Amino acid sequence: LSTFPEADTDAGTLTAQGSRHGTTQMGVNWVSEAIRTRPAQVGFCQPHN
Amino acid sequence: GVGVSTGSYDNQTHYRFLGDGWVEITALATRLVHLNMPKSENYCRIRVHNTTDTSVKGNMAKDDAHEQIWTPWSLVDANAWGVWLQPSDWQYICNTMSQLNLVSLDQEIFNVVLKTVTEQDLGGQAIKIYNNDLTACMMVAVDSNNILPYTPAANSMETLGFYPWKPTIASPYRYYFCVDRDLSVTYENQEGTVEHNVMGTPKGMNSQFFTIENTQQITLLRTGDEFATGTYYFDTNPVKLTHTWQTNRQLGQPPLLSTFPEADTDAGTLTAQGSRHGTTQMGVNWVSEAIRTRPAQVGFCQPHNDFEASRAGPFAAPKVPADITQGVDKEANGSVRYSYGKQHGENWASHGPAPERYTWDETSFGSGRDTKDGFIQSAPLVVPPPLNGILTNANPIGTKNDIHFSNVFNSYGPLTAFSHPSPVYPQGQIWDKELDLEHKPRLHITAPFVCKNNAPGQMLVRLGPNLTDQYDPNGATLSRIVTYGTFFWKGKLTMRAKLRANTTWNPVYQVSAEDNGNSYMSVTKWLPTATGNMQSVPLITRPVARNTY
Amino acid sequence: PERYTWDETSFGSGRDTKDGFIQSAPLVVPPPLNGILTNANPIGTKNDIHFSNVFNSYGPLTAFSHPSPVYPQGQIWDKELDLEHKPRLHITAPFVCK
Amino acid sequence: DFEASRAGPFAAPKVPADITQGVDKEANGSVRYSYGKQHGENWASHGPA
Amino acid sequence: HFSNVFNSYGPLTAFSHPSPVYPQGQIWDKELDLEHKPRLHITAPFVCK
Amino acid sequence: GVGVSTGSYDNQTHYRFLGDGWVEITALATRLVHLNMPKSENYCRIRVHNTTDTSVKGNMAKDDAHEQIWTPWSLVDANAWGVWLQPSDWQYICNTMSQLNLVSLDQEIFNVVLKTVTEQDLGGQAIKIYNNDLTACMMVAVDSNNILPYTPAANSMETLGFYPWKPTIASPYRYYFCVDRDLSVTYENQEGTVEHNVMGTPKGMNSQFFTIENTQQITLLRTGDEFATGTYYFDTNPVKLTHTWQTNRQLGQPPLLSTFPEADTDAGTLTAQGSRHGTTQMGVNWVSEAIRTRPAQVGFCQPHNDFEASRAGPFAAPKVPADITQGVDKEANGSVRYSYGKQHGENWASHGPAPERYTWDETSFGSGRDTKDGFIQSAPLVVPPPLNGILTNANPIGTKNDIHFSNVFNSYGPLTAFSHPSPVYPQGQIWDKELDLEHKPRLHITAPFVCKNNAPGQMLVRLGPNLTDQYDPNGATLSRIVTYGTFFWKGKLTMRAKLRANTTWNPVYQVSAEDNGNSYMSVTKWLPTATGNMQSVPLITRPVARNTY
Amino acid sequence: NTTWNPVYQVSAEDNGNSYMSVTKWLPTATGNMQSVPLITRPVARNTY
Amino acid sequence: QTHYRFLGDGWVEITALATRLVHLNMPKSENYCRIRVHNTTDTSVKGNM
């Protein structure tokens, strides 16, 4: 994160998604926590009932 | 003592052929890491919540809201391929070898220097005086028992630099604290409300605050001190440096052809489908290449661009990488996209703040899935099928037209046989700790060499606190004299590789470096410019093919 | 009898069914109406069957923990099935006899 | 289902299983053979099939 | 219908491997050279290890 | 040498199970103590006399008038529980263990650095230049023979900090000189005079001036020097980590009941009191639970809020801690109140100058005394007693109404059996030197582990005097170049604990960490905030119960 | 014990409306025991 | 009772012992008999699979 919280209430803003590093599986040119590449899926979606 | 060196710079890679086509590659790396003092030396969790992207309707994939314990420790993580091997060495261990394996790893910190900055003017404006510091210490606790969370620095592209003649930066250590996220799914400009954007309070069960002090045994390195970790012996599995080309329609004996081509242009007609031998899975009385029985399915159809959600917000399901097939689908096969920085293989002459991106096309040509040319017929096979007897990739699933059946079809079965993806050059990741779960995944899509027993030790370094005379251990301002330091890091990663066996008649594919031009392998890339601006672009890992079956 | 729904403590491998979705193969953010399969669209004619009832996302890199031993009314062991290819776990006993 | 990856459409190989009372020889993957005359056909079969 | 798209192969699916078919069967088969191998072959009971 | 480190940071705690339910806890602590130069380097006694609180009528309890020899030495005293164990370790050595004992203790000073400050301007206003100092010394005399007065620094809450990632302060050593105080007792706004507020001149018999130089053997530590004390082996008694619940009316066999309850709501009636067996101490011909003969009294009635006075002014009599019982009396049972500072477990975000206070409620439920529901009957027992035949807690003793009989009643007898109070977490005190008196007290209300033979050595540290060129050993100004220093301290306290034996059917009480909220055990306390503000609140020491008799 | 904060523990709470009241695992006035399920994995572990 | 027998470096040997008084009654009949259970009172209603 580029900015840190001054008080104990607000949140620290990360680096902007356009100029951010990492890997993704999608073709878009921004990295977020959702589309970021992880080692393995943890819980599988099973067909229920 | 203070005026003597406690180490030796060494960066070369040695090939040590040790009998019947076995190589012992001993890659050595050495950099000058530049440690700066932390922002604050307190452990603090900072919840990140972006209600500027996520509050807009339809931005669940633009969500990176989480919580992190921010430790005041920096992490020396050499877990990329470009740290050890130069680009002329990923050409020798790709054209010539046929299998790579990891053997050991030992790291060392030496030639530590710490120095403070002071202010003087000399012209009416303040300049810095970089005064030396002979009694300050550096704290170098390595985590060989793996109690702390595993943060591989090749995820945020925060490893050591790939050029040995540059000073690098140490990445700050921070890990994930577990709070609950609740985001509601929403399509684009929906006439409604988001209704769920809440971040949760810390739960009592799954809350882990890990201090580096209470868990590790820290070594205080002064100016004349060195540190050395013992050789960590790997227990991984060998990846192959030969790509596969046989798809599911090229497994087994080809059908015997009754007529042969006279000239070199026409094709030989096979035996007619009515009176043809073989086995099928369908009930029809004709055998073709499509419906013929094969030993195993090679590439599985994975549900692409799906976003699961469980107690931490929506995240994309990790797809196994595969080949794009002629209708090119870089997202439906899971081709990894990189966003590496300027010390990891960008052009140094790029003035812009944006990183350089590269979509990694996987070389395994057999296990790839053309999503637009797949279909599903009815349970009694009729050829040609009617309109209501085939599910093509033009029919809508649900109300929405843009979601066809290839987005929901998960054809991973009990006889799916795929190869594991290739080690990506420079900005790859060499190893990864296997997850502590009771049933383990078959692979990791971030590292070729998953450690079977224990990960190598994370080397955490920080600067010891230098205090002024005014200090109060009650409510203070933390004056803290402005210190920094540089230290040399030297690692040795031993590898073991098997040489190739030339069996084919035709010349095989080789990663040759072409002339200057518009090609991908022009030599002008891996060569410094007139002001010395190197760039390191990825190389092909598996040039030569191998026979699957 | 007395009934009790056993909530599993493994918080990582859990799936919120109403807040999962599937976008189109070229990723566009924010997606349009016909470019996302949410948990409000009907699968088939029937409205009450959404895509989370038919989606089986068990893949080759699914890593989950095996469920916990339930106290008193659990079951300690179970005989492994005599089939030629065996299941990965039993949902009735923590200790499958090898 | 007919998958397609760089070599044309091919059927996904189903694990064989029992047909159950509504008989589905294709939904369970019952293998169909097309053996010739030296592999267990009636030798008196004059036909080419 | 939904049985054509439903893939219910899960982490606790326990099936037996199919039988050796008489005369026109196949006794052995070479295991594929892939980095992650299939669980069975639907053409041969005895996959050579 | 000067450019090499002479020690190793280590802070973890090791559990070393050594057979039949015996643990060997080896707690390690390490901090960075910040030594500053003394105010003056002369020994001086400073009589403190507050004739602004004590001259007011009725403020004998607001008196802190005394005399102290103020030595120019600072004291490194790690005599609190929070120095050694982290709060996740006072949960393991309270839920799982059943008995704790102290085994050894060894301390070490290393990585000493001393540096001076100078002035430069650079902007027209003076700033400091923290210049190094390679030839100044640090004097680290430990007192292993116990000749000096024992000043435990856990009394003024002046021990080392409980968070290992913070620099601490060394507390200045000062002890009590013996002068006579004479204060007259006075009630509130009495129409009279105080008449006695005199502080006495030094007596000839009991006057002890103790210099650290003439009694100890001092080690001069330079920058490259270390110091190590040998392992002091403790000889204490084990405290139990299981609380007692049986009061005096729950000792022995319960009376056999003639009728049993049919439903689950009503109670079973006992045998009638006229025809009942057993023994009593009274002369009446009926046995009840109240007047039945028991083996020993469990909790004694101590005279609470009494102020004795002998040659040094009024002081409160130390009460043995006990449980508050349903009419809650935190003062009548002697529940200790703490006033810990900001480096000892206050919220760091507390902007105020006031400390954080906590009344420690004792967990021993059996030996507790409800003062309002106790009474004394006449010597021939008549039930029910008349008005002049019972001394309740509503009758006045003396003229004053607010002093009832429970303030003067001291029922400590020859068969009073109580448990010793629990070790209070972080801001407790681990050991205490037993008094040198000819007849010793049964316990100490400040420490669970009273040392039976000899206390561990007080580690006294100071800075060696750095002088300017202008120096006169006659009447001087003591110029004394402005020096400070930091040194690392590392102690190891070995403990020994016995694991629990689960005998009961129901689940026992456990110190579990609850979810975030308004509970006392929310996890948000033992977790750093968004700017890193830790707080350490006390934990329950004896969760599980034990059977007294 | 590796963490700094106190970990979750299956403690038996006081009598009331909580799930872990001690009145459950205790016989009544006529001896009517009940055994309700307990949490098996209180303490957390680090997956990766 | 249940015995805990700590046997070195953090290894416990739990030896749980159980004992009850089982009350055996004579069987309904001492013949082996297969009893087909078929509920055409719930299953014949529409929608009760």
Compact overview of the structure:
The structure is cut from a larger assembly and holds eight copies of chain A. Chain A is mostly loops and 49 residues long. Chain A has no helices and one strand.
Would you kindly provide a written description of the structure presented here, covering whatever features stand out?
Chain E: It is found in: Virion; Host nucleus. Chain E: Belongs to the parvoviridae capsid protein family. Chain E: This is Capsid protein VP1. Chain A has 49 residues and is largely without helices or strands. Chain A contains no helices and 1 strand. Chains in contact: A-B, A-C, A-E, A-F, B-C, B-D, B-E, B-F, B-G, C-E, C-G, D-E, F-G, F-H.
Radius of gyration of chain A: 16 Å
Oligomerization state = part of a larger assembly
Helix/strand/pairing class of chain A, anyone?
little secondary structure
Shape descriptor of chain A: flat
Determine the number of helices of chain A (DSSP H or I, runs of at least 4 residues).
0
- What is the rounded distance between the termini of chain A? 43 Å
Subcellular location (chain G): Virion; Host nucleus
Organism (chain G): Murine minute virus (strain MVM prototype)
Family (chain G): Belongs to the parvoviridae capsid protein family.
Protein name (chain G): Capsid protein VP1
Question: Which helices and strands, and how do they pair?
Answer:
This is part of a larger assembly, with eight copies of chain A.
Chain A: E1 23-24
Subcellular location (chain G): Virion; Host nucleus
Organism (chain G): Murine minute virus (strain MVM prototype) (MVM)
Family (chain G): Belongs to the parvoviridae capsid protein family.
